[PDB]
Design a protein around this ligand. Structure first.
Ligand SMILES: O=C(Nc1cncc2ccccc12)[C@@H]1CCOc2cc(Cl)c(Cl)cc21
Lengths: 305, 302
């Protein structure tokens, strides 16, 4: 029993974290095989950030300008190239701790674990979701750039996020490991704002199934709804539309608990229109949307890595 | 900016997780140097749950009855001893991945990370607090026994908890790494119940300081209170008494935000009286009590 916000074990990623220093800037890098990946803004000054020409800034740099440190060992940079908003520093040594890995781009609503790092040293791990507005509600301080987000499937680490910046509202923006930003963000000091966020409907439904599996049933009702009527109500409450794909993904949880997805949708509709009335679900007075259906199945069945 | 429930990176503990099998029972063990620590109930059968005599059950066992597996390598048990509710299995190989470590017994309100494991394999990492009733609200299934709780301040792992059992209400009980249970619990299937749980007041106050540091001030008020008047109010909401130790511990956060502890206590009294009125604090509609003053300082300042 119990349902916690749970991250993947971070060990495979910890053995990849290195510190990258360029001039006065120090941030984190991801050391996989003989390449160190890090945000390209490490080559910027405070002035450069206002209007940066990264090809021009990078061409002026030499390999010895990049100081890479893996623990207490300085790595030798033997090449440098840029791929979108990520800098790739070729090093002379392949990381002996390189796990089986892939670079994957996640969709909004998908969750992942973040290994927050400072000076190439892991300090914490937390689970979060890629918001529908492409930001993440992380917890990051100065020096956390280059910290990565990942999932584990079997013994393979799928790297899906690299931290680049904090927006004025305190939310975070970054890229996949190919340097493509999630969202309409750019790595330049200019006016940028997160769009209005919405609730990840499929994830709230998955969390209501987790609550039922854990014995919390007060919100269940005798009713069902059509997918179209549910989506009309979802649009009204700034909830993401629920697709037939989402309904299909929730199938196993529906089969296990005996609550059809549209029956759970009718519970969610009543919760949106009437509130919780002083009650809680899994120790929360708000509907939680940072557990995917896969996360609920994984946690309620005990899959290991 | 931002405030998340954050666990320590679990790598140093992952390299210590092994599978321990004794008869039909399989659970997790912690492999440090040449010793594997695990719950002593791994030696129990069906009739040895209601009233087990662990000394008598252990004396009947030989080293070859304990099957220890570290990855895909079977470890050889060369000795066994019991220390309170933990079984210590001496093995013929020292764990090469043994980090710098300590065994620390914690107090209620303290937080720690749990590396939940099944069959010696880590499945997830989450953050817990030792409840005032000495239980933990973990997330554990059958086979999670032997999973450990830890903190990693510096490069040293302080092991503080080993999971032993789930109580009828779905909460969890366990021991420190010396086998001493937290709380009035025993490793017997006898009728046991968690006492009435209370809110960790000092932790809620720390989390209100984290909210102020993060820019949230709506709950602040112009009132202060005496420590005794605060305790008389807070007890009525099943909150733990706030001691002078707790007030002292909150000093650095009070100095940083400019809000005296008793001034923050008056905000907490008002939040208990009024509720949140549709508002949230750090993305929560409930007062959070699983961040200590130490966690808040570390997460907010470094
Ligand atoms: O609690 C137990 N293991 C579990 C742990 N955590 C979570 C669980 C969730 C579901 C089912 C088992 C779970 C075992 C088996 C059941 O009976 C006992 C009894 C005693 Cl006295 C002791 Cl010390 C251990 C156990």
């Amino acid at each position: 029993s119990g349902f916690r916000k749970m991250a993947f074990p971070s060990g495979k990623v910890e053995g990849c974290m290195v510190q990258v220093t360029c001039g006065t800037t120090t941030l984190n890098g991801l050391w996989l095989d003989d390449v160190v990946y890090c945000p390209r803004h490490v080559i910027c000054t405070s002035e450069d950030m206002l209007n940066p020409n990264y090809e021009d800034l990078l061409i002026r740099k030499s390999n010895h300008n990049f100081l890479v440190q893996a623990g207490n060992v300085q790595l030798r940079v033997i090449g440098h190239s840029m791929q979108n908003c990520v800098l790739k520093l070729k090093v002379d040594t392949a990381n002996p701790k390189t796990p089986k890995y892939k670079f994957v781009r996640i969709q909004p609503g998908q969750t992942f674990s973040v290994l927050a790092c400072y000076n190439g040293s892991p300090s914490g791990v937390y689970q979060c979701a890629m918001r529908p507005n492409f930001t993440i509600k992380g917890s990051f301080l100065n020096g956390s750039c280059g910290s990565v987000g990942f999932n584990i499937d079997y013994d393979c680490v799928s790297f899906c996020y690299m931290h680049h910046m904090e927006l004025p509202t305190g939310v975070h923006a970054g890229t996949d490991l190919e340097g493509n930003f999630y969202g309409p963000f750019v790595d330049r000091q200019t006016a940028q704002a997160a769009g209005t966020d919405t609730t990840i409907t499929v994830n709230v439904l998955a969390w209501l199934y987790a609550a039922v599996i854990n014995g919390d049933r007060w919100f269940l009702n005798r009713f069902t709804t059509t997918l179209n009527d549910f989506n009309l109500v979802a649009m009204k409450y700034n909830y993401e539309p629920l697709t037939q794909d989402h309904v299909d993904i929730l199938g196993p949880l529906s089969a296990q608990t005996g609550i059809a997805v549209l029956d759970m949708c009718a519970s969610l509709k009543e919760l949106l229109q009437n509130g919780m009335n002083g009650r809680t679900i899994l120790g929360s007075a708000l509907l939680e949307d940072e557990f995917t259906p896969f996360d609920v199945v994984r946690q309620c069945s005990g899959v290991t890595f």
